[PDB]
Amino acid sequence: SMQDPLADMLTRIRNAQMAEKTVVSMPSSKLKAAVAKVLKDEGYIADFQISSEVKPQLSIELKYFEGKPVIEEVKRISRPGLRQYKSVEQLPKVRGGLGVSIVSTNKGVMTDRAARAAGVGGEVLCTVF
Amino acid sequence: ATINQLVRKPRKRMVDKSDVPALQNCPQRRGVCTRVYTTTPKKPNSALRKVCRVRLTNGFEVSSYIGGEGHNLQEHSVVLIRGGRVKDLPGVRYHTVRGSLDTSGVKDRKQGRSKYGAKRPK
Amino acid sequence: TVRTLTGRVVSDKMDKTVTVLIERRVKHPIYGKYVKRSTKLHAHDESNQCRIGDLVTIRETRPLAKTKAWTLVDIVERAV
Amino acid sequence: GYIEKLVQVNRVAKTVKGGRIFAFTALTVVGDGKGRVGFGRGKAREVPAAIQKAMEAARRNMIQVDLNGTTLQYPTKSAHGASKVYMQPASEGTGIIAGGAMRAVLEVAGVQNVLAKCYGSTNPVNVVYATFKGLKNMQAPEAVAAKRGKSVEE
Amino acid sequence: ARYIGPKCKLSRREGTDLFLKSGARALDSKCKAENVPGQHGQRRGRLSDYGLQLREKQKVRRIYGVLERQFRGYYQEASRRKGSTGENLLQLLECRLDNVVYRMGFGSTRSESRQLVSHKAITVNGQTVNIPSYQVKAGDVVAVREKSKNQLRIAQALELCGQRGRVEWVEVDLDKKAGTFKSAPARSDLSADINENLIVELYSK
RNA sequence: AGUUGGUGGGGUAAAGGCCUACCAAGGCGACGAUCCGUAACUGGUCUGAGAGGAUGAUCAGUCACACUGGAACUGAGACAC
RNA sequence: AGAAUAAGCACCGGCUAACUUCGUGCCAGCAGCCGCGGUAAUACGAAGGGUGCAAGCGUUAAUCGGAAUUACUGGGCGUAAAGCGCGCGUAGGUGGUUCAGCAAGUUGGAUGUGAAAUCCCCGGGCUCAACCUGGGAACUGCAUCCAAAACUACUGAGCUA
RNA sequence: ACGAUGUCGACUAGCCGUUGGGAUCGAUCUUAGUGGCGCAGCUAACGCGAUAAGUCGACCGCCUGGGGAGUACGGC
Ligand SMILES: [Mg+2]
Ligand SMILES: [Mg+2]
Ligand SMILES: [Mg+2]
Ligand SMILES: [Mg+2]
Ligand SMILES: [Mg+2]
Ligand SMILES: [Mg+2]
Ligand SMILES: [Mg+2]
Ligand SMILES: [Mg+2]
Ligand SMILES: [Mg+2]
Ligand SMILES: [Mg+2]
Ligand SMILES: [Mg+2]
Ligand SMILES: [Mg+2]
Ligand SMILES: [Mg+2]
Ligand SMILES: [Mg+2]
Ligand SMILES: [Mg+2]
Ligand SMILES: [Mg+2]
Ligand SMILES: [Mg+2]
Ligand SMILES: [Mg+2]
Ligand SMILES: [Mg+2]
Ligand SMILES: [Mg+2]
Ligand SMILES: [Mg+2]
Ligand SMILES: [Mg+2]
Ligand SMILES: [Mg+2]
Ligand SMILES: [Mg+2]
Ligand SMILES: [Mg+2]
Ligand SMILES: [Mg+2]
Ligand SMILES: [Mg+2]
Ligand SMILES: [Mg+2]
Ligand SMILES: [Mg+2]
Ligand SMILES: [Mg+2]
Ligand SMILES: [Mg+2]
Ligand SMILES: [Mg+2]
Ligand SMILES: [Mg+2]
Ligand SMILES: [Mg+2]
Ligand SMILES: [Mg+2]
Ligand SMILES: [Mg+2]
Ligand SMILES: [Mg+2]
Ligand SMILES: [Mg+2]
Ligand SMILES: [Mg+2]
Ligand SMILES: [Mg+2]
Ligand SMILES: [Mg+2]
Ligand SMILES: [Mg+2]
Ligand SMILES: [Mg+2]
Ligand SMILES: [Mg+2]
Ligand SMILES: [Mg+2]
Ligand SMILES: [Mg+2]
Ligand SMILES: [Mg+2]
Ligand SMILES: [Mg+2]
Ligand SMILES: [Mg+2]
Ligand SMILES: [Mg+2]
């Protein structure tokens, strides 16, 4: 009953990429907005925009390049049932370094390589390829 | 199983029981032969195998197989038995070592005559 | 710099003593999930000023009785 | 590409009034050794003819895989039916650490250091299916750069 | 220990080079070295992968005359050593003392080289070494005894090995019956027909 | 039911229900108390890609015992191979 | 001085490297699993001939692996074993969104310990190795402090999906 | 005691019926149930397919070869 909304955001994005949609809307959240900013900067999504009037809506437009979608495998790691926390040395490199992992560190929400550049670990939110 | 369910009750391994309950973690054991006789095998096969009832040192009463073409076992002969299950005879789970105490091995065996306790003709 | 320990008062029916529950969350050695464990300690309340429900911080000293080797240094929160 | 490899030969039978009719199925993998590979199946009344039909099928529908200089790109996990497959790149010294259908597929394709394992059922046909469904789907660099420039992605 | 028996029945079984004689006449016109021995000899006998591993492992062991406890110890040491164990095994197995005193040209056969090395007739720096397993460090001047320099068996072995090839990494002075090893051989130096990877595949199972 | 806490005293080299007389009814427990079976513990050993699984032969640290059950004397130290 | 003086065991139908003949004829016998034998047995018992190890070779008993076959890494429940007959609810587990604080979890660092040996890396000695030995690495652990505030927890004040 | 399918929540092409209501101009839209097909996706296959057996979260129950056996003994 809406216990974990970040996985809900990821599931909406994956289900749209599977049904070949161009835009996706969802209820807005600060964590979701941070993750969307990181994903947009990394290049997995085209653009995102946040509405106003008390019930903000986060909207994301998707990319496909070829007939396939750009985000082929997005999944959750630290669900509210495990709460996985990792150190700098033991952070996960995904797909041999061609993917990214979103990590919430004490300096904000960034990617695994950016976290290593600052030598700081945190909580692994989700992995994207 | 959910992680919480496993925390409340962890996964448990089931122990493996021994196929040779007698001779408790022992390579082979001595006994005395109560009775020698012959038996019929299971359905696909047909023969007259030679099995001896043995009373061990501990007290277990077991059956054992006299492997070979001839034997010299009477009722009161001391024998030594080792693990190994005769697949054909129901209930037999041990083998009498040839030429150990009162078996003397089998005579005039040339090919692989170490499993049957025969000496080198040389 | 005394090594204190914070806890919640549970029962005080024995004179000049107080029972304190201290809650910790330990990580399961294999499954990686945190579980809340609790410890019951007995502390010396010289002037029995701690009623039930109060939240206090104790300190380790020499044994005062059998199974009583802690003394409360000061109450940090009261109860309703 | 031309390097044969006969993965399996099996005997099957169908029932008719009077008795049984026998046939032989051959599963084979064919490739060159630098990234082209395909697999084929052939059933015939005789073992040789089955092998040649398998080879002809294998030469058709032969695909291209982008390998990382005698090594895989990244650890990958694939599946087909009830069979699951895991592979990951290895160092230069290591050989092909795999078993059965996987070893045939990998040594024909061109890789040499694979360190692979398989879980679930071990049917050679389904294992070959899973191994291609894994190898075919790798991306290689400057193709994950389908988002932005390179050297800012690795 | 050591192997005693026919030295070409092995070649007939394996069907390959398998140097085991002096090489005076030839390799062929002694034993029709193209058929496996015994009554059942003409059959090619197509053999599975395990056959391949067993056959080449026996090939290498018989050419270098090493037993299997020693061979597996050699393989474990090679696996311990870094950098593509497959050729590390060959490099380390080549540095044996008996095979060096053979390949230096002092012996007609590996067995005769072992004969010489065991009976205390060869030096390393003047010190008596008679273990046919000594791993010769690069730089050592392997030589025969000043007493033994007049034996004619060494002379005949040397003149026979005078035409067998040049390895192009050792520096050998032939007048004084001495050898010298500079650096370990490369993979390309040895005969590039038998692969090393199939052995490490065998021992990885 | 000396069971939990307090007071006075005793006792030990030393804190302490360690012992005693009174005061109150407390204390522990499904986070497994009590009871039954089994077993010296650790560094470590064997396996395993790892996580784990089994285990405590040699060597080293700690503990306990000395035909069975108790008790004290001597001393710096013993309830004494 | 003298080649003098010192080779055995198992196996050969498939899994698993290695075949022919003779003798019995569902008998005698073999066997880890499929299984061989009733009158040409490469599976029984012997011969030759091979294959594998070797001062050893097999057999038995015991542990882990293969076994993703107790699945944290890493399994499942319509029909193969597996959703309580169905609600309500205690402890427990989990918690929509905003602002602010704190610093238990979380992260980085410093300090003390983690006995020696054993494990790992580079050397030294016994003709090498086994074995002995120097230096280093490691011992994921634990405790005490300093700094950060994204997420969880705790505190206060809100908002309406 | 069966949908042989635990409860709760979020997303994912469409077509044809029917039950209890709303709107807009017999038609269109929408809501809570009840049925038949069907694209993706899933499945060993049969088949499921917005009333998932699809993609995801929270919590609970249960399984570990067939017999002996849901039996024997003890407890309630
Ligand atoms: Mg057995
Ligand atoms: Mg299976
Ligand atoms: Mg030896
Ligand atoms: Mg009293
Ligand atoms: Mg007092
Ligand atoms: Mg008192
Ligand atoms: Mg005490
Ligand atoms: Mg208990
Ligand atoms: Mg014990
Ligand atoms: Mg005991
Ligand atoms: Mg123990
Ligand atoms: Mg004891
Ligand atoms: Mg190891
Ligand atoms: Mg494993
Ligand atoms: Mg002892
Ligand atoms: Mg000790
Ligand atoms: Mg004592
Ligand atoms: Mg005593
Ligand atoms: Mg006695
Ligand atoms: Mg006494
Ligand atoms: Mg005294
Ligand atoms: Mg004494
Ligand atoms: Mg074979
Ligand atoms: Mg046999
Ligand atoms: Mg015959
Ligand atoms: Mg035979
Ligand atoms: Mg396991
Ligand atoms: Mg097992
Ligand atoms: Mg799991
Ligand atoms: Mg299963
Ligand atoms: Mg049924
Ligand atoms: Mg139900
Ligand atoms: Mg219930
Ligand atoms: Mg309820
Ligand atoms: Mg509650
Ligand atoms: Mg929240
Ligand atoms: Mg809560
Ligand atoms: Mg820390
Ligand atoms: Mg140490
Ligand atoms: Mg701060
Ligand atoms: Mg049911
Ligand atoms: Mg359900
Ligand atoms: Mg439901
Ligand atoms: Mg449901
Ligand atoms: Mg639903
Ligand atoms: Mg349908
Ligand atoms: Mg199913
Ligand atoms: Mg059972
Ligand atoms: Mg009953
Ligand atoms: Mg009853």
Curated annotation (Swiss-Prot), chain A:
Belongs to the universal ribosomal protein uS8 family. One of its GO terms (biological process) is translation. The keyword RNA-binding applies. GO terms for cellular component: cytosolic small ribosomal subunit. This is Small ribosomal subunit protein uS8. HAMAP family: Ribosomal_uS8_B. InterPro entries: Ribosomal_uS8, Ribosomal_uS8_CS, Ribosomal_uS8_sf. Coiled coil: none annotated. It comes from the Bacteria. Keywords: Ribonucleoprotein, Ribosomal protein, RNA-binding, rRNA-binding. Part of the 30S ribosomal subunit. Contacts proteins S5 and S12. One of the primary rRNA binding proteins, it binds directly to 16S rRNA central domain where it helps coordinate assembly of the platform of the 30S subunit. One of its GO terms (molecular function) is rRNA binding.
Curated annotation (Swiss-Prot), chain B:
GO terms for cellular component: ribosome; small ribosomal subunit. Residues 99-122 are annotated as: Disordered. GO terms for molecular function: rRNA binding; structural constituent of ribosome; tRNA binding. It comes from the Bacteria. InterPro entries: NA-bd_OB-fold, Ribosomal_uS12, Ribosomal_uS12_bac. The modification 3-methylthioaspartic acid is found at D88. Keywords: Methylation, Ribonucleoprotein, Ribosomal protein, RNA-binding, rRNA-binding, tRNA-binding. SUPFAM superfamilies: Nucleic acid-binding proteins. GO terms for biological process: translation. Residues 112-122 have a biased composition (Basic residues). Part of the 30S ribosomal subunit. Contacts proteins S8 and S17. May interact with IF1 in the 30S initiation complex. NCBIfam families: rpsL_bact. Belongs to the universal ribosomal protein uS12 family. With S4 and S5 plays an important role in translational accuracy. This is Small ribosomal subunit protein uS12. It comes from Pseudomonas aeruginosa (strain ATCC 15692 / DSM 22644 / CIP 104116 / JCM 14847 / LMG 12228 / 1C / PRS 101 / PAO1). The lineage of its organism: Bacteria, Pseudomonadati, Pseudomonadota, Gammaproteobacteria, Pseudomonadales.
Swiss-Prot record, chain D:
It comes from the Bacteria. GO terms for molecular function: rRNA binding; structural constituent of ribosome. GO terms for biological process: translation. The gene is rpsE. Pfam families: Ribosomal_S5, Ribosomal_S5_C. This is Small ribosomal subunit protein uS5. GO terms for cellular component: cytosolic small ribosomal subunit. The N-terminal domain interacts with the head of the 30S subunit; the C-terminal domain interacts with the body and contacts protein S4. The interaction surface between S4 and S5 is involved in control of translational fidelity. With S4 and S12 plays an important role in translational accuracy. Keywords: Acetylation, Ribonucleoprotein, Ribosomal protein, RNA-binding, rRNA-binding. Residues 2-65 form the S5 DRBM domain. Belongs to the universal ribosomal protein uS5 family. InterPro entries: Ribosomal_Su5_D2-typ_SF, Ribosomal_uS5, Ribosomal_uS5_bac-type, Ribosomal_uS5_C, Ribosomal_uS5_N, Ribosomal_uS5_N_CS, Ribsml_uS5_D2-typ_fold_subgr. Part of the 30S ribosomal subunit. Contacts proteins S4 and S8. It comes from Pseudomonas aeruginosa (strain ATCC 15692 / DSM 22644 / CIP 104116 / JCM 14847 / LMG 12228 / 1C / PRS 101 / PAO1). PROSITE patterns: RIBOSOMAL_S5, S5_DSRBD. The keyword Acetylation applies.
Curated annotation (Swiss-Prot), chain E:
This is Small ribosomal subunit protein uS4. Part of the 30S ribosomal subunit. Contacts protein S5. The interaction surface between S4 and S5 is involved in control of translational fidelity. GO terms for molecular function: rRNA binding; structural constituent of ribosome. GO terms for biological process: ribosomal small subunit biogenesis; translation. It comes from the Bacteria. It comes from Pseudomonas aeruginosa (strain ATCC 15692 / DSM 22644 / CIP 104116 / JCM 14847 / LMG 12228 / 1C / PRS 101 / PAO1). SMART domains: Ribosomal_S4, S4. The gene is rpsD. InterPro entries: Ribosomal_uS4, Ribosomal_uS4_bac-type, Ribosomal_uS4_CS, Ribosomal_uS4_N, S4_RNA-bd, S4_RNA-bd_sf. Residues 95-155 form the S4 RNA-binding domain. The keyword Cell cycle does not apply. Belongs to the universal ribosomal protein uS4 family. Keywords: Ribonucleoprotein, Ribosomal protein, RNA-binding, rRNA-binding. One of the primary rRNA binding proteins, it binds directly to 16S rRNA where it nucleates assembly of the body of the 30S subunit. GO terms for cellular component: small ribosomal subunit.
